[PDB]
Protein backbone atom coordinates (compact mmCIF):
# COMPACT_ATOMS: atom_id res chain seq x y z
CA UNK A 1 0.00 0.00 0.00
CA UNK A 2 2.96 2.38 -0.33
CA UNK A 3 5.64 3.17 -2.87
CA UNK A 4 8.32 0.72 -3.96
CA UNK A 5 6.85 -2.63 -2.85
CA UNK A 6 7.95 -4.67 -5.84
CA UNK A 7 8.67 -8.36 -6.39
CA UNK A 8 10.54 -9.19 -9.58
CA UNK A 9 10.07 -12.05 -12.05
CA UNK A 10 12.92 -13.17 -14.26
CA UNK A 11 11.55 -14.66 -17.53
CA UNK A 12 14.50 -15.68 -19.69
CA UNK A 13 14.17 -16.31 -23.43
CA UNK A 14 14.17 -19.62 -25.29
CA UNK A 15 14.58 -20.49 -28.98
CA UNK A 16 16.43 -23.07 -31.00
CA UNK A 17 19.34 -20.70 -31.54
CA UNK A 18 19.74 -19.71 -27.90
CA UNK A 19 20.23 -23.28 -26.66
CA UNK A 20 22.90 -23.88 -29.30
CA UNK A 21 20.94 -26.26 -31.51
CA UNK A 22 20.85 -24.25 -34.74
CA UNK A 23 22.01 -26.10 -37.82
CA UNK A 24 22.04 -29.42 -35.98
CA UNK A 25 21.76 -32.64 -37.94
CA UNK A 26 23.09 -36.08 -38.70
CA UNK A 27 23.66 -37.76 -42.08
CA UNK A 28 25.60 -34.80 -43.50
CA UNK A 29 24.48 -32.79 -46.52
CA UNK A 30 22.51 -34.16 -49.44
CA UNK A 31 24.88 -33.14 -52.25
CA UNK A 32 27.92 -31.12 -53.17
CA UNK A 33 27.27 -27.64 -51.76
CA UNK A 34 27.39 -24.34 -53.65
CA UNK A 35 28.13 -20.71 -52.90
CA UNK A 36 26.27 -18.20 -50.73
CA UNK A 37 23.79 -15.59 -51.93
CA UNK A 38 22.96 -12.54 -49.83
CA UNK A 39 19.55 -14.00 -48.99
CA UNK A 40 20.89 -16.55 -46.50
CA UNK A 41 22.86 -13.89 -44.66
CA UNK A 42 19.49 -12.27 -44.01
CA UNK A 43 18.09 -15.60 -42.83
CA UNK A 44 21.02 -15.90 -40.43
CA UNK A 45 21.74 -12.46 -38.96
CA UNK A 46 18.58 -10.45 -39.62
CA UNK A 47 16.96 -8.72 -42.56
CA UNK A 48 18.96 -5.52 -42.07
CA UNK A 49 22.32 -7.18 -41.52
CA UNK A 50 25.54 -6.06 -43.16
CA UNK B 1 -23.70 43.81 23.40
CA UNK B 2 -20.64 46.07 23.09
CA UNK B 3 -18.24 46.72 20.24
CA UNK B 4 -15.09 44.68 19.81
CA UNK B 5 -16.52 41.33 20.97
CA UNK B 6 -16.09 38.85 18.13
CA UNK B 7 -15.10 35.29 17.27
CA UNK B 8 -13.11 34.81 14.08
CA UNK B 9 -13.80 31.94 11.69
CA UNK B 10 -11.18 30.81 9.15
CA UNK B 11 -11.68 29.32 5.70
CA UNK B 12 -9.34 27.97 3.03
CA UNK B 13 -9.37 27.47 -0.73
CA UNK B 14 -9.63 23.87 -1.92
CA UNK B 15 -9.17 23.06 -5.62
CA UNK B 16 -7.17 20.60 -7.65
CA UNK B 17 -4.51 23.31 -7.91
CA UNK B 18 -3.68 24.16 -4.31
CA UNK B 19 -3.69 20.59 -3.00
CA UNK B 20 -0.86 19.83 -5.43
CA UNK B 21 -2.76 17.55 -7.81
CA UNK B 22 -2.55 19.60 -11.00
CA UNK B 23 -1.88 17.72 -14.21
CA UNK B 24 -2.13 14.30 -12.58
CA UNK B 25 -1.52 11.55 -15.10
CA UNK B 26 -0.94 7.81 -14.82
CA UNK B 27 -0.46 6.82 -18.47
CA UNK B 28 2.13 8.16 -20.87
CA UNK B 29 5.90 8.25 -20.59
CA UNK B 30 7.97 8.28 -17.40
CA UNK B 31 10.58 11.00 -17.12
CA UNK B 32 11.46 13.53 -19.72
CA UNK B 33 12.73 11.55 -22.72
CA UNK B 34 16.21 11.93 -24.21
CA UNK B 35 17.98 11.03 -27.44
CA UNK B 36 18.84 7.68 -29.05
CA UNK B 37 22.15 5.83 -29.34
CA UNK B 38 23.56 2.76 -31.05
CA UNK B 39 22.84 0.17 -28.36
CA UNK B 40 19.07 0.58 -28.67
CA UNK B 41 19.18 0.21 -32.44
CA UNK B 42 21.19 -2.95 -31.86
CA UNK B 43 18.64 -4.30 -29.39
CA UNK B 44 15.70 -3.43 -31.64
CA UNK B 45 16.94 -4.78 -34.99
CA UNK B 46 19.91 -7.01 -34.23
CA UNK B 47 23.60 -6.81 -33.46
CA UNK B 48 24.79 -6.10 -37.03
CA UNK B 49 22.04 -3.63 -37.95
CA UNK B 50 22.48 -0.91 -40.57
- Whether A48 sits inside 8 A of B47 (CB atoms) is no
Pick the closest to residue A42 from B39, B41, B48, B38 (CA basis): B48
> What is each CA distance from B17 to A16, A26, B23, in whole angstroms?
56, 72, 9
In three state form, how does the secondary structure of chain A look? Answer: CCCCCCCCCCCCCCCCCCCCCCCCCCCCCCCCCCCCCHHHHHHHHCCCEC
Pick the closest to residue A46 from B48, B40, B37 (CA basis): B48
Chain B residue with CA closest to A41: the answer is B48
**Resolution of the entry in angstroms:** 3.4
Provide residues of B within 8 Å CB-CB of chain A: 45-50
**Experimental approach taken:** cryo-EM
Half-sphere exposure of residue B28: CA atoms within 13 angstroms, side-chain side: 7
Q: Which residues contact A41 (CB under 8 A, 6 or more apart)?
A: A49
- Whether B46 sits inside 8 A of A48 (CB atoms) is yes
Min Cα separation A48/chain B (Å): 5
Amino acid sequence: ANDGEIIAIDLKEITAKTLGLDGFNVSGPKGTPAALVAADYQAAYGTTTN
